[PDB]
Design a protein around this ligand. Sequence first.
Ligand SMILES: COc1ccc(/C(C)=C/C(=O)O)cc1
Ligand SMILES: [Zn+2]
Length: 258
Amino acid sequence: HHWGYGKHNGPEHWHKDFPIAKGERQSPVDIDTHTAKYDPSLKPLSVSYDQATSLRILNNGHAFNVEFDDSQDKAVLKGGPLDGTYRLIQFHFHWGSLDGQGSEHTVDKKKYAAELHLVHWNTKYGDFGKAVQQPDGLAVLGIFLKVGSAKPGLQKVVDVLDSIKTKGKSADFTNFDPRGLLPESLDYWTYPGSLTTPPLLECVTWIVLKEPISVSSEQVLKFRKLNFNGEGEPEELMVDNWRPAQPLKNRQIKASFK
Ligand SMILES: COc1ccc(/C(C)=C/C(=O)O)cc1
Ligand SMILES: [Zn+2]
């Protein structure tokens, strides 16, 4: 597979190798704030990242992933719409060439500069690869980035990007605290959906925070200096690695807040 974000291999092409691209619960979607209903039955959301063990950062030719030790319950997401315990495995972002685009979810058709995805899997399925085969296998916590003041808790990430410019490069990335990437409020929207990259599997409970975090123009500019290409290949800047909104179909988006 040779998917990407360009004219010739981008999201309008994915369905030929990954037919589920045109399925019934694809992500991302537009969150219409006037149609999402408050759901009083939602339990509060529990983000327990105190014992998080980050290990490594990797440029995969599509984005960069910050990877965690998920061999025990060290950093978990519970509550909200979820049953049981979901282990943090990795986070990554999607971003734009310009500040007016980059996020995958939109809010009343508003696009943010970027979007952070913290990816967790349901420990009842034992490993990540088994979990992505289940309709409730993953919980992805999604956080909007807007350009403004600097996010101090992001700067360790920004500063390591020079060392993983090109596809296939990785760097040690221990002792990074993902709590530093969270906004103040845990108010969220939730809906059932999918992975937003191939293989596009329909295995995700999406939990999208309402409150964006602010990052600096200098921070996001450093994301835009990454490369999709490998070392010694023609330079293609890693920008616009977002999938656009997909049809909502027969789904309801629920709000945790009034
Ligand atoms: C089985 O291979 C996989 C590849 C990518 C992913 C993710 C986590 C994709 C995304 O962020 O949309 C999962 C499994
Ligand atoms: Zn993502």
